[PDB]
Design a protein around this ligand. Structure first.
Ligand SMILES: Cc1cc2nc3c(=O)[nH]c(=O)nc-3n(C[C@H](O)[C@H](O)[C@H](O)COP(=O)(O)O)c2cc1C
Ligand SMILES: *P(=O)(O)OCC(C)(C)[C@@H](O)C(=O)NCCC(=O)NCCS
Lengths: 182, 830, 163
């Protein structure tokens, strides 16, 4: 009826193949966990940053198209325990994977929004030099204006952020990548 | 305290717990059954031989029931009720017998005749055990009608559907004689009374009309010429319709008035219109045999008087010989003409009527479909018409694939129907006066107050209850004089249609199915047990089934493929279709064009604009030359932007450097969203290679003809999860084109395409604006060809984007392009 | 004698001929299915059902293409297999016409022994038997061996392999 306000809105329009309310949940993977059902549960129902994160099969590095690493990381295996907090508010949602680490259960991965358009997948090593856990923040731009591939690695400083992690795990010195190889 | 008794045939067996009080009564029967049961063979594939335990227990129930006398409760009655209750518990898991009979046909190596034995035996037993169908069945369909998910309309066919209509009546009395036995016995004695009462009626009915004798003893049945004659065929096609309506009412355990109250409306093709007003009066099993007495009386007095008005005279043998060798059948007064539109047929009948006088003229008497007419008139005249027609007709063999569409000879069928009188014609108008005077002699009138449901007139489609004049007069007038406009009468809204009428698969139902495919109507053939491999229209079992299989729905294309609007966070509006949903960009693609899309600057300018475009492989001669092109595209487009690749199929050298290049670029994560194979459709194994190995999102295919479309469909069934983009283009497209129309192939194949939810169906050729594309997006394009709507998922614009700023096409070629006035679609074959 | 898988052209000819209750010669291969059945649409759609059960996928309007142009299209994706329909037609043929003590196996070994025909040709002869069903109880065993002999000589005359 010539009214733009009746038009259903979504975050990003795209990715949907032609063949196809809980705020604080706690999923447990098993040996027999139906992988596609698993990811559909992690994603949720609202089309948002976590729907993209768990059901996009591809992300973008600069202009290339690589397999979705968030899906590879969260791929369900015995022991895994995914706890979602603030499932309804997308701006505060925190997906927190925990695995068995030295017998007991520890937070390994913490997928969340950092700013409006940045998804931060903090990967956590617990087996470190001084016992304190070491974080590797991997950063992804979430662009809803490109519905087909809304997620893309932030490739600026990715090598420096990876190095800075490996440094804390390997070298007992002040972090400084400015010395001569020769 | 029960002794187990095993009854077996070869390997298969069934153990029943026969009470010791009546074991020696059951153990003698076991032997006598084992006598009559033949010698087991491998597969059990012989007739009169059970293949499953279910239809062996069935045979036993049939054998026992034969010996049981229904009045005097003898010894075998007590073991029948136990053997029946064992058959129900073990094999009927809540379902009806018809649902079981269906399940045996699709799993086991049983036949239709064998499952009709099973049903007969079960139903015979059930009535000989004093166990009538008093309980209302939980049939999914009628449950859904109560809830209000399903609207039901009952249609009744007439003549012309089958040669041997009587074999359907024999098959009813052969199977359900314990239900309808009282209907047939009443109808026979009603008719036998009407023959004696009516003046000069015994002279027409030379061999009488006691149909009980003809059903008992098949030898006393008159010849097929007597049966086909309309004085016999009219009433007995009435009887067959009412018989299917009885059986359906009893097996569901409804009264007639109960089963009628579930129908939203009824109507009838031709003389079926009589039976449709009869069931609309019915109340209960007591007053049912009054409605039947009306229906039998009307049809009878039509037959008797329509025969006397225009008797069918012997034909010269030259005409009969000529009609058989030319595959037009035995000349009759009614001639079906399939695959010609009504204005074409009306042109041919005007040319034919020009020569003939008034009395010998032919008219169009039934418009069953858009492209499915029936012409009434004298058989000489209709032969005349048929000679005119067969000159225009194209032979069966010839391949017109290389001829322009408008220069092709029209491929259509013309066959004489098996019917003795010209119904719906000016020839039977003298009769009209006589029938009305004879219906008031037997006090057969229909009143709008007695008619509970709306019964739809055949001519205009109006309800018969709202008429001013007598209903019986309008019915007779609609049968004998007025044409039938079947598309105009069936314009009612209804999710399900029950075809009681005779024929079954070749009956009125399946014809109404073809006219209504993609309007979300499901035809159930309520007079035939079978299996449909495509499962687009149901058979009898779907009425009675109690599970989810009982309530099925047929696709509504307008509603299932409706274009929508959706809005991303930024507030950018997108036409939402199957195709735009997948690619996340408008459903508009610029296809691969040599040389317009060979340019990496154009492919990138288009991809940056927001719209999908193919890089043309036909402007590259080596992997290295195309790799450098691809790298020039990638360097210019934005992050996350994709594009596709067009390879020509008829250039095998291109495919040889091309397919491995795409595979190893896709492995390295180049943004190649999809591949479009032009100039031909691949073979199943080549397409299976492209789908599985290349790591693409979807595959575009450009079928040229029908056979190509069928080859795309076959690729889509092979990988039902993988999105195919069927890019349909007519001959009217620029560059390498076909001879095909834009419209005619889709109208034919659109249904078969939409049975594959992975096929994203994209219309191309002759588009340059929203205005000329809108009707395709909506589906209203196909309402000009008298079809349901047929929405498309997207479009392609080749020629329209040849004069864009970013196209390499030289400025002077752009002035030559703009100078072309072009033509409309009716004139492109010049 | 060499092993050759049955031709789609033969199998299709037998299915149409068997269904219409006519001899294999009375059906010309340069003729459409709707032409041969004529009036009876009931016969047409249950033939197209039999072609759908036997070969699987069918071309569009198969009742408007002559049986040659239909068989050549079927022959592409077909390879010697009797599938569901012809298997269950032959199972009916022998259980009703061949006497007791005459299974498919005994007829298969007899065609292998006496005539020297492998499985590709045995199928072929069994199909030529189906098309010219004797419609009679062949109680006498030797009578049924004279039947399979006449059909192996018919199969030889059609395909053109000397015996
Ligand atoms: C200049 C030109 C070049 C074309 N090149 C190709 C090609 O290489 N491969 C192909 O499959 N189709 C090609 N086509 C056909 C288009 O893909 C498309 O079918 C057609 O342009 C649609 O009709 P329209 O252009 O009148 O809108 C070409 C069309 C044009 C006008
Ligand atoms: P087949 O697949 O060609 O079947 C078509 C048909 C038999 C259903 C159809 O030709 C038909 O029945 N037309 C006859 C029209 C009619 O029902 N009655 C004519 C006498 S009033």
């Amino acid at each position: 009826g010539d009214d733009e306000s009746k038009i259903p809105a979504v975050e990003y329009f795209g990715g949907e193949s032609p063949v196809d309310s809980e705020d604080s949940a706690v999923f447990k993977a098993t040996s027999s966990t139906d992988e596609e059902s698993w990811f559909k549960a992690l994603a949720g129902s609202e089309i948002n940053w976590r729907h993209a994160s768990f059901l996009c099969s591809f992300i973008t590095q600069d202009k290339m198209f690589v397999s979705n690493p968030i899906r590879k990381v969260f791929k369900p295996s015995q022991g895994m325990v995914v706890e979602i907090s603030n499932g309804n508010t997308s701006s505060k949602t925190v997906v927190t994977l925990s695995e068995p680490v030295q017998g007991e259960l520890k937070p390994t991965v913490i997928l969340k929004l950092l700013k409006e358009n940045i998804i931060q997948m903090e990967m956590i090593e617990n087996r470190t030099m001084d016992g304190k856990p070491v974080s590797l923040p991997l950063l992804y731009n979430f662009n809803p204006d490109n519905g087909f591939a809304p997620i893309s690695e932030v490739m600026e400083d990715r090598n420096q952020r990876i190095k800075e992690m490996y440094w804390k795990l390997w070298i007992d010195e002040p972090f400084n990548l400015d010395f001569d190889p020769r | 305290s029960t002794r187990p008794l095993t009854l077996s045939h070869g390997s298969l067996e069934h153990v029943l717990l026969v009470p010791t009080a009546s074991f020696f009564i059951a153990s003698q029967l076991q032997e006598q059954f084992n006598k009559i049961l033949p010698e087991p063979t491998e597969g059990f594939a012989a007739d009169d031989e059970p293949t499953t335990p279910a239809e062996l227990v069935g045979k036993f129930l049939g054998y026992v029931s034969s010996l049981v006398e229904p009045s005097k409760v003898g010894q075998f009655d007590q073991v029948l009720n136990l053997c029946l209750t064992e058959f129900e518990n073990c094999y009927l898991e809540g379902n009806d017998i018809h649902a079981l009979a269906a399940k045996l046909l699709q799993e086991n190596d049983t036949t239709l005749v064998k499952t009709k034995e099973l049903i007969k035996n079960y139903i015979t037993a059930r009535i000989m055990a004093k166990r009538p169908f008093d309980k209302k069945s939980n049939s999914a369909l009628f449950r859904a009608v109560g809830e209000g998910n399903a609207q039901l309309v009952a249609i009744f066919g007439g003549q012309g559907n089958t040669d041997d209509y009587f074999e359907e009546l024999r098959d009813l009395y052969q199977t359900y004689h314990v239900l309808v036995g009282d209907l047939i016995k009443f109808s026979a004695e009603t008719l036998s009374e009407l023959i004696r009462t009516t003046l000069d009626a015994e002279k027409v009915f030379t061999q009488g009309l006691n149909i009980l004798e003809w059903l008992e003893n098949p030898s006393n049945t008159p010849d097929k010429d007597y049966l086909l004659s309309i004085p016999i065929s009219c009433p007995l096609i009435g009887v067959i319709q009412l018989a299917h309506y009885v059986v359906t009412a009893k097996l569901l355990g409804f009264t007639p008035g109960e089963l009628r109250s579930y129908l939203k409306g009824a109507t009838g093709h031709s003389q079926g219109l009589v039976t449709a007003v009869a069931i609309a009066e019915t109340d209960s099993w007591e007053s049912f045999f009054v409605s039947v007495r009306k229906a039998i009386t009307v049809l009878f007095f039509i037959g008797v008087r329509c025969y006397e008005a225009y008797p069918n005279t012997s034909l010269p043998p030259s005409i009969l010989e000529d009609s058989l060798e030319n595959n037009e059948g035995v000349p009759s007064p009614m001639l079906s003409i399939s695959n010609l539109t009504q204005e074409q047929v009306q042109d041919y009948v005007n040319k034919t009527n020009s020569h003939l006088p008034a009395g010998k003229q032919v008219e169009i008497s039934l418009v069953n479909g858009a492209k499915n007419l029936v012409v009434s008139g004298p058989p000489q005249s209709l032969y005349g018409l048929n000679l005119t027609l067969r000159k225009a007709k194209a032979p069966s063999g010839l391949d017109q694939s290389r001829i322009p569409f408008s220069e092709r000879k029209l491929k259509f069928s013309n066959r004489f129907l098996p019917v003795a009188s010209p119904f719906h014609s000016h020839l039977l108008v003298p009769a009209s006066d006589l029938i009305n005077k004879d219906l008031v002699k037997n006090n057969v009138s229909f009143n709008a107050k007695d008619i509970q449901i709306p019964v739809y007139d055949t001519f205009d489609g109006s309800d018969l209850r709202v008429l001013s004049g007598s209903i019986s007069e309008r019915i007779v007038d609609c049968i004998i004089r007025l044409p039938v406009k079947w598309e105009t009468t069936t314009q009612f809204k209804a999710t399900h249609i029950l075809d009681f009428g005779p024929g079954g698969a070749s009956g009125l139902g399946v014809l109404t199915h073809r006219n209504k495919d993609g309007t979300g109507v499901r035809v159930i053939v309520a007079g035939t047990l079978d299996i449909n491999p495509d499962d687009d229209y149901g058979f009898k079992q779907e009425i009675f089934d109690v599970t989810s299989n009982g309530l099925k729905k047929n696709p509504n294309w307008l509603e299932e493929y409706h274009p929508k609007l959706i809005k991303n966070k930024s507030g950018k509006i997108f036409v939402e279709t199957k195709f735009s949903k997948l690619i996340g960009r408008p459903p508009l693609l610029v296809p691969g064009m040599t040389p317009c899309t060979v340019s990496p600057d154009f492919v990138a300018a288009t991809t940056n604009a927001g719209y999908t475009i193919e890089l043309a492989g036909g402007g590259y001669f080596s992997a290295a030359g195309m790799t450098a092109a691809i790298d020039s595209v990638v360097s210019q487009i934005e992050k996350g932007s994709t594009f596709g690749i067009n390879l020509i199929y008829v250039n095998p050298f291109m495919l040889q450097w091309g397919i491995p290049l795409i595979k190893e670029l896709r492995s390295k994560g180049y943004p190649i969203q999809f591949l479009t194979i032009g100039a031909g459709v691949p073979s199943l194994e080549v397409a299976s290679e492209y789908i599985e190995t290349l790591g693409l999102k979807y595959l575009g295919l450009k079928p040229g003809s029908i056979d190509a479309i069928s080859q795309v469909i076959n690729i889509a069934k092979a990988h039902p999860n993988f999105p195919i983009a069927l890019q349909w283009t007519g001959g009217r497209g620029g560059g390498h084109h076909s001879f095909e129309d834009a419209h005619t192939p889709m109208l034919q194949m659109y249904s078969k395409i939409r049975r594959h939810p992975n096929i994203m169906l994209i219309f191309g050729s002759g588009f340059g604006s929203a205005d000329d594309t809108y009707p395709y997006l909506t589906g209203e394009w196909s309402t000009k060809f008298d079809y349901p709507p047929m929405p498309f998922d997207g479009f392609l614009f080749g020629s329209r984007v040849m004069i864009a700023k970013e196209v390499k096409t030289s400025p002077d070629a752009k002035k030559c392009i703009a100078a072309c006035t072009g033509v409309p679609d009716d004139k492109w074959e010049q | 004698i060499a092993d050759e898988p049955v031709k789609a052209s033969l199998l299709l000819h037998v299915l149409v001929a068997h269904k219409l209750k006519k001899s294999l010669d009375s059906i010309p291969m340069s003729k459409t299915i709707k032409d041969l059945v004529g009036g009876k649409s009931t016969v047409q759609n249950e033939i197209l059902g039999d072609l759908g059960k036997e070969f699987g996928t069918t071309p569009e309007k198969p009742e408007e293409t002559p049986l040659e142009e239909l068989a050549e299209t079927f022959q592409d994706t077909f390879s010697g297999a009797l599938g569901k329909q012809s298997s269950s037609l032959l199972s009916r043929l022998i259980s009703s016409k061949m006497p007791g003590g005459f299974t498919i196996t005994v007829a298969r070994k007899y065609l292998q022994t006496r005539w020297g025909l492998p499985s590709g040709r045995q199928d072929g002869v069994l199909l030529v038997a189906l098309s010219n069903e004797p419609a009679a109880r062949l109680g006498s065993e030797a009578d049924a061996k004279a039947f399979l002999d006449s059909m192996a000589q018919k199969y030889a005359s059609i395909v053109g392999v000397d015996l």
